[PDB]
From a paper:
NAD(P)H:quinone oxidoreductase 1 ([name]; EC 1.6.99.2) is a dimeric (61.7 kDa) human cytosolic FAD-dependent enzyme catalyzing the two-electron reduction of intracellular quinones to hydroquinones. [name] is an essential component of the antioxidant defense system, preventing the formation of potentially harmful semiquinone radicals. A frequent single-nucleotide polymorphism (SNP) in the [name] gene (on human chromosome 16q22.1), whereby C609 is changed to T, results in the replacement of Pro187 by serine in the protein. Overall, our structural and biochemical experiments reveal that the proline to serine replacement disrupts the interaction of the core with the C-terminus, resulting in a disordered tertiary structure that ultimately leads to greatly diminished enzymatic activity.
To analyze these putative structural differences, we solved the X-ray crystal structure of [name] [name] (for data collection and refinement statistics). Initial crystallization attempts were successful in the presence of an equimolar concentration of Cibacron blue and excess dicoumarol. These crystals diffracted to 2.7 Å and showed a structural topology that was almost identical to that of the [name] crystal structure, with an rmsd of 0.33 Å for 249 Cα atoms. The FAD-binding site of [name] [name] showed no discernible differences, with both the flavin isoalloxazine ring and the AMP moiety engaging in the same interactions as in [name]. The same was true for the region around the amino acid exchange site, where no significant structural differences between [name] and [name] [name] were observed. Although our spectroscopic and kinetic measurements have documented the effects of the proline to serine exchange on catalytic function, the determined crystal structure of [name] [name] is almost identical to [name], and hence does not provide a structure-based explanation for the lower enzymatic activity. However, we noticed that crystallization of [name] [name] was much slower than that of [name] (weeks rather than days), suggesting that [name] [name] might be present in a less ordered state in solution. Cibacron blue and dicoumarol are both competitive inhibitors of NADH, indicating that occupation of the NADH-binding pocket stabilizes the C-terminus and thus prevents proteolysis during crystallization. Overall, contrasting structural evidence from X-ray crystallography and NMR spectroscopy led us to assume that both disordered and structured conformations of [name] [name] exist simultaneously.
Author numbering:
A (entry chain A): 4 to 273
B (entry chain B): 4 to 274
């Protein structure tokens, strides 16, 4: 069992670093082979460019990134820092994303990590996406710390449902490539947590990773219910559309179908 | 009136760049003072660090960006790039974010732009946020070109409702700082769009800009319905919670209240 920890924070004194290192000690004691990826420490470049391709470009005039990136992968002409990361992606059974919440999403350095590493054919394919994604036998977690409390991200909060915020990350990025997303570890208002309570959070996180691989993941609508061709528009099957019309709740946050959204569908397991 | 355009594409030969240039010339046509912000061309730094503070750090031992960046702004110890961008904001009346949809969100360079430019005390404040935000006089628009199609992001699409994908950007980032978000300009299935069809998209976009200041912005639950208190935990007033009990719809995407979401809340204007 091998695991990969990705950390997007610039400081060592950060609670994210402490939250990272805690995961390491907890998993290593369980017999895990853990590798890390402090994005800031590596001086990782999150900005995609034509230099991501180390081979002869197919069209140096009109450059299209999703075209040259797929070709380079099949020929081994991606940037050496991207290939290095991809080797860790496949070798790792569990992937942990540790970061502070930043403007209702991941930090730029992490967003750019996704963009450069999740290259077509490697991470995803339209002939094998979501349920059939390359990373099927793999589980992903989100370990986030926010400045705001949990009430502010409640259904009756000022910012809105936190479930909505985590959707374009856990669904469209993680699950899209086959990943099984587990229940996110949410840390609301960490800047306002008493000293001896912070110490407890580290323990609840370390105890969790003792039996995390046997957890029940979040629910997504399986693609077995979609047409999955380019002429139908990848829409849902009418056999199912007529079935889901008698229900009160939608399938998921993005697959709500103009009706009620399942409580904590993106934070709590089904 | 002044307009700011923030372009996020590495390629000059991209349709996003065409969409930027066409938007520029259309505004200058109507006597707009147009300022541009080509991130890739500006070699903009998208990563936050203590390097963002040129002065002396309050605590180089235990460094915290949010609490340390607010200080530099107050005293004027911010990086020249950040300040040069913060001035373009304040000056302009209309902000346009031109970018390709990348992984169900914005490019890192644009995300980093938000992270370094939008600093506390300037862009936002716990007392002055959303409806009472600092940028409550200004308007913002999203101009997006996606790979997938409109049906893929339809309600029954494999990807899901675009309104959900657009919410954390428009509500959590734009509106949070006071902005008035207009109807996003979505260009689906680009690359599968014919040449003569791509020349018409530009003109229609240039036409919309003619009377875009007189458009209706997207709906967001007014902060008046909430108790802006920490003892109340910034929740909806019980007076308001008892009003929205006999209803079968929420107020927005993030304020669905476990109920239904108003159709096209993040793409189509109110009513
Ligand atoms: C650009 C930007 C955008 C942001 N956007 C958002 C947003 O949209 N929403 C939002 O809610 N927040 C936002 N934030 C705030 C951000 O979420 C918080 O700053 C972050 O979650 C906490 O930072 P940190 O995890 O590095 O911990 P720090 O703030 O560095 O540390 C928190 C506390 O943990 C303590 N600590 C450190 N190490 C240990 C240890 N080993 N044991 C015990 N205690 C320890 C420290 O004493 C410190 O007081 C944003 C911040 C930035 C910079
Ligand atoms: C890292 C990454 C993540 C992505 N994530 C997503 C995602 O989550 N969802 C999604 O849907 N898509 C995604 N995409 C795909 C992305 O949305 C498209 O590649 C992008 O929208 C293409 O837009 P462009 O500005 O590059 O235009 P281009 O694709 O460069 O332009 C297309 C065509 O327009 C023509 N053209 C250019 N200028 C003009 C002009 N002035 N007049 C007429 N024709 C012109 C060009 O000749 C070209 O053939 C992603 C891509 C990347 C690289
Ligand atoms: N850095 C923070 C922080 S912090 O904890 O690190 O200071 C916190 C933080 N949210 C956040 C901000 C303030 C407070 N609380 C807060 N704030 C002030 Cl200025 N005064 C008081 N005192 C106060 C005043 C009157 C009544 C009661 C009280 S109380 O102390 O008992 O809560 N409380 C609380 S809470 O946990 O106490 O509810 C969360 C944020 C951020 C952000 O950086 C940020 C960035 C972008 C968007 C949003 C945020 C953001 O929200
Ligand atoms: N880069 C691409 C590209 S590429 O053009 O740049 O090579 C292309 C591309 N896909 C992509 C690009 C163009 C179309 N356009 C396309 N094609 C056909 Cl055969 N028919 C129609 N008709 C059509 C026209 C308008 C509206 C709806 C429809 S409908 O077919 O969905 O009913 N449109 C269609 S389709 O789903 O509608 O078939 C997918 C994607 C991506 C992505 O990067 C990407 C990333 C994450 C998730 C998804 C994608 C992605 O889908």
């Amino acid at each position: 069992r091998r695991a990969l920890i990705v950390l997007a924070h610039s400081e060592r004194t950060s609670f994210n670093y402490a939250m990272k290192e805690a995961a390491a000690a907890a998993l290593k004691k369980k017999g895990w082979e853990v590798v890390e990826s402090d994005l800031y420490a590596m001086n990782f470049n999150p900005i995609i460019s034509r230099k991501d391709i180390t081979g002869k470009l197919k069209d140096p005039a009109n450059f299209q990134y999703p075209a040259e990136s797929v070709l380079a992968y099949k020929e081994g002409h991606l940037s050496p820092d991207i290939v290095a990361e991809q080797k860790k992606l496949e070798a790792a059974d569990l992937v942990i994303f540790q970061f502070p919440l930043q403007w209702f999403g991941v930090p730029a350095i992490l967003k750019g990590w996704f963009e450069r590493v999740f290259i077509g054919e490697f991470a995803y394919t339209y002939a094998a996406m979501y349920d059939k994604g390359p990373f099927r036998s793999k589980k992903a977690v989100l370990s986030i710390t926010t400045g705001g409390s949990g009430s502010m991200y409640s259904l009756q909060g000022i910012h809105g449902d936190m479930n909505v915020i985590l959707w374009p990350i856990q669904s469209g990025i993680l699950h899209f490539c086959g990943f099984q997303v587990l229940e996110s570890q949410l840390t609301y208002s960490i800047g306002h947590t008493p000293a001896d309570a912070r110490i407890q959070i580290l323990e609840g996180w370390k105890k969790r990773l003792e039996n995390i691989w046997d957890e029940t993941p979040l629910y997504f609508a399986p693609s077995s219910l979609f047409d999955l061709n380019f002429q139908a528009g990848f829409l849902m099957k009418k056999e199912v559309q007529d079935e889901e019309k008698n229900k009160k709740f939608g399938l998921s946050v993005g697959h709500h179908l103009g009706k009620s959204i399942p409580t904590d569908n993106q934070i709590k397991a089904r």
